[PDB]
Amino acid sequence: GLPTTTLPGSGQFLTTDDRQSPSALPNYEPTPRIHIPGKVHNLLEIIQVDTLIPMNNTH
Amino acid sequence: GLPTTTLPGSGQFLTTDDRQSPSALPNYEPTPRIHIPGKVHNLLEIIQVDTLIPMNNTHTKDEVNSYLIPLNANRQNEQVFGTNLFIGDGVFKTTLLGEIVQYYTHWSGSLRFSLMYTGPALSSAKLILAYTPPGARGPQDRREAMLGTHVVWDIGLQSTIVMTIPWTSGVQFRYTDPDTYTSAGFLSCWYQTSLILPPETTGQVYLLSFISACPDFKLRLMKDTQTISQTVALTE
Amino acid sequence: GLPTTTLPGSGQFLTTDDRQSPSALPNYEPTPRIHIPGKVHNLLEIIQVDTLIPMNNTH
Amino acid sequence: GYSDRVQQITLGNSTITTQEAANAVVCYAEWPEYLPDVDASDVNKTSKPDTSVCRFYTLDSKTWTTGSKGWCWKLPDALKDMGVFGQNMFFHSLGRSGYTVHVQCNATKFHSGCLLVVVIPEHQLASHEGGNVSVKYTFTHPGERGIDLSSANEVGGPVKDVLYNMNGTLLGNLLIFPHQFINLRTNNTATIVIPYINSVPIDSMTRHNNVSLMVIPIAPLTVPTGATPSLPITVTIAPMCTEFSGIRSKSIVPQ
Amino acid sequence: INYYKDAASTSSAGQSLSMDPSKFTEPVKDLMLKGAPALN
Amino acid sequence: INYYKDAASTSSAGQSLSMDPSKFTEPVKDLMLKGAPALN
Amino acid sequence: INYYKDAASTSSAGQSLSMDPSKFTEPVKDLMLKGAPALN
Amino acid sequence: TVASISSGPKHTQKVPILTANETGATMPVLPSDSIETRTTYMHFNGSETDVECFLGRAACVHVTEIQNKDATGIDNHREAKLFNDWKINLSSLVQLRKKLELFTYVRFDSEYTILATASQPDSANYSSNLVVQAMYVPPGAPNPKEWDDYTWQSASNPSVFFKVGDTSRFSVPYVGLASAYNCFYDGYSHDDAETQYGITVLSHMGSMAFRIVNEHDEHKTLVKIRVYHRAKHVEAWIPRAPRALPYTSIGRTNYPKNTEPVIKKRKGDIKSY
Amino acid sequence: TVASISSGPKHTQKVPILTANETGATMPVLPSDSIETRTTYMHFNGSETDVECFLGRAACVHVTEIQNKDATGIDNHREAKLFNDWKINLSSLVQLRKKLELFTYVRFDSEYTILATASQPDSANYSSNLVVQAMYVPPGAPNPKEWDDYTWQSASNPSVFFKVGDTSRFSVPYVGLASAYNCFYDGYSHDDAETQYGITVLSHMGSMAFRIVNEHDEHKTLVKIRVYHRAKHVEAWIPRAPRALPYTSIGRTNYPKNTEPVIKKRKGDIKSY
Amino acid sequence: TVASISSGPKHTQKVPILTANETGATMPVLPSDSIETRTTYMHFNGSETDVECFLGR
Ligand SMILES: Cc1cc(CCCCCCCOc2ccc(C3=N[C@@H](C)CO3)cc2)on1
Ligand SMILES: Cc1cc(CCCCCCCOc2ccc(C3=N[C@@H](C)CO3)cc2)on1
Q: Which of I173, G13, B7 is nearest to C23 (CA)?
A: I173
Contact: chain D with chain H (3+ CB pairs below 8 Å): yes
CB D4 within 8 A of CB D231: no
What one-character DSSP code corresponds to residue A25?
A: S
Domain covering G1-40 in this structure, CATH number: 4.10.80.10
Substitution candidate for ligand 2 out of I62, I64, I89, I169 with most atoms within 8 A of CB: I89
Q: How many other CB atoms sit within 10 Å of the CB of residue I261?
A: 8
Regarding beta strands D14-18 and D25-26, do their DSSP bridges make them parallel or antiparallel, or are they unpaired? Answer: unpaired
Half-sphere exposure in the Cβ direction for E39 (13 Å, CA) = 5
For residue I158 and ligand 2, the question of a CB distance below 6 A is answered with yes
What one-character DSSP code corresponds to residue G24?
A: H
- J55, closest residue in chain H (CA to CA): H156
Beta bridge partners of residue H117, listed in sequence order: H224
Q: List, in order, residues 6 or more apart from F24 with CB less than 8 Å away.
A: B45, B46, B48, B49, D28, D176, H239
Asked if the Cβ–Cβ distance from I215 to H222 is below 8 Å, we say: yes
For residue I31 and ligand 2, the question of a CB distance below 6 A is answered with no
For residues D171 and H242, give the distance between their C-alpha atoms in angstroms, rounded to a whole number: 11
Rounded to 5°, the CA angle B199-B205-B209 comes to 150
Residues with their C more than 2.5 Å from the N of the next written residue in chain D, i.e. before a break, are none
DSSP, residue by residue, D21-89: ----EEGGG-------GGG--S-BPPB--GGGTSS-EEPPPEEEETT---EEEEETGGGTTSHHHHHHH
Q: What are phi and psi of D44, to 5 degrees?
A: -75, 140
The residue whose CA is least distant from atom 22 of ligand 2 is I181
Q: Does A12 touch chain C (CB under 8 A)?
A: no
- Please, what sign has the CA dihedral across residues I245, I247, I248, I253? positive
The number of distinct structural domains making up chain H is 1
Torsion of CA B4, C24, H88, H192, to 10 degrees: -150
Asked if the Cβ–Cβ distance from G34 to I232 is below 8 Å, we say: no
Q: Which of D149, B99, B55, B103 is nearest to H244 (CA)?
A: B99
CB H194 within 8 A of CB H206: no
Domain ranges (residues) in chain F: 1-40
How long is chain J?
57
Q: Tell me, what amino acid is at H109?
A: D
Q: Tell me, what amino acid is at D184?
A: L
CA–chain centroid gap for D181, Å, is 15
Asked if the Cβ–Cβ distance from C7 to A1 is below 8 Å, we say: yes
Q: Which of B113, B107, B149 is nearest to B131 (CA)?
A: B149
Q: Which of I114, I119, I117 is nearest to I208 (CA)?
A: I114
Instruction: Provide the terminal-to-terminal Cα distance of chain D, rounded to the nearest Å.
Output: 52
For residues D119 and C29, give the distance between their C-alpha atoms in angstroms, rounded to a whole number: 37
Contact: chain C with chain G (3+ CB pairs below 8 Å): yes
Beta bridge partners of residue A2, listed in sequence order: B4
Q: Does C3 touch chain E (CB under 8 A)?
A: yes
Residues with their C more than 2.5 Å from the N of the next written residue in chain I, i.e. before a break, are none
Domains defined for chain B, CATH in brackets: 1-236 (2.60.120.20)
Domain ranges (residues) in chain D: 1-255
For residues I246 and D231, give the distance between their C-alpha atoms in angstroms, rounded to a whole number: 79
Q: How many other CB atoms sit within 10 Å of the CB of residue I186?
A: 9
For residues D25 and D34, give the distance between their C-alpha atoms in angstroms, rounded to a whole number: 20
Asked if the Cβ–Cβ distance from H48 to C27 is below 8 Å, we say: yes
Q: Which CATH class is domain D1-255?
A: mainly beta
Q: Does F33 touch chain B (CB under 8 A)?
A: no
For residues B218 and H47, give the distance between their C-alpha atoms in angstroms, rounded to a whole number: 10
For residues D45 and I185, give the distance between their C-alpha atoms in angstroms, rounded to a whole number: 75
In this structure, what CATH number is given to the domain that contains residue I57? 2.60.120.20
Asked if the Cβ–Cβ distance from B29 to J50 is below 8 Å, we say: no
I267: domain range? 1-273
Q: Tell me, what amino acid is at D135?
A: V
Instruction: Provide the terminal-to-terminal Cα distance of chain G, rounded to the nearest Å.
Output: 58
Residues with their C more than 2.5 Å from the N of the next written residue in chain G, i.e. before a break, are none
**C-alpha to C-alpha distances, E20 to A46, E16, E27, J46, nearest whole angstrom:** 9, 11, 12, 13
CB D174 within 8 A of CB D121: no
Which conformational region is residue H140 in: left (phi greater than 0), alpha (psi within -120 to 50 degrees), or beta?
left
- The helix/strand/coil state of H253 is coil
For residues I160 and B14, give the distance between their C-alpha atoms in angstroms, rounded to a whole number: 4
Q: Tell me, what amino acid is at I217?
A: D
CB-count burial class (<10 Å; 0-12, 13-18, 19+) for I26: middle
Tell me what percent of chain H is helix, strand and coil, each rounded to the nearest 5.
10, 30, 60
CB I216 within 8 A of CB I67: no
The residue whose CA is least distant from atom 4 of ligand 1 is H136
Torsion of CA D181, D186, D190, D193, to 10 degrees: -90
For residue I168 and ligand 2, the question of a CB distance below 6 A is answered with no
Rounded to 5°, the CA angle B36-F17-H104 comes to 30
Asked if the Cβ–Cβ distance from A14 to H158 is below 8 Å, we say: yes
Q: How many other CB atoms sit within 10 Å of the CB of residue F22?
A: 14
Asked if the Cβ–Cβ distance from F28 to D25 is below 8 Å, we say: yes
- Resolution of this structure in Å: 3.0
Rg of chain E (C-alpha set): 21
CB H252 within 8 A of CB D167: no
For residues D114 and D117, give the distance between their C-alpha atoms in angstroms, rounded to a whole number: 10
Ligand nearest to the CA of I138: 2
Chains interfacing with H (3 or more CB pairs < 8 Å): A, B, C, D, F, I, J
- The helix/strand/coil state of H32 is helix
Half-sphere exposure in the Cβ direction for D5 (13 Å, CA) = 13
Q: What are phi and psi of C23, to 5 degrees?
A: -80, 130
Q: Tell me, what amino acid is at I218?
A: E
Q: Tell me, what amino acid is at H10?
A: K
The residue whose CA is least distant from atom 7 of ligand 1 is H172
Substitution candidate for ligand 1 out of H208, H227, H228, H230 with most atoms within 8 A of CB: H208
Q: Which helix (H) or strand (E) holds I104?
A: strand I103-119
Beta bridge partners of residue D115, listed in sequence order: D182, D217
For residues F11 and D127, give the distance between their C-alpha atoms in angstroms, rounded to a whole number: 40
User: H112 alpha carbon to ligand 1 midpoint, in Å?
Assistant: 9
Q: What are phi and psi of H115, to 5 degrees?
A: -100, 135
The CA distance from D192 to the nearest CA of chain J, in Å, is: 31
- Please, what sign has the CA dihedral across residues D244, D248, D250, D253? negative
The residue whose CA is least distant from atom 19 of ligand 2 is I183
**C-alpha to C-alpha distances, D110 to B122, B202, D64, H23, H140, nearest whole angstrom:** 6, 10, 16, 22, 66
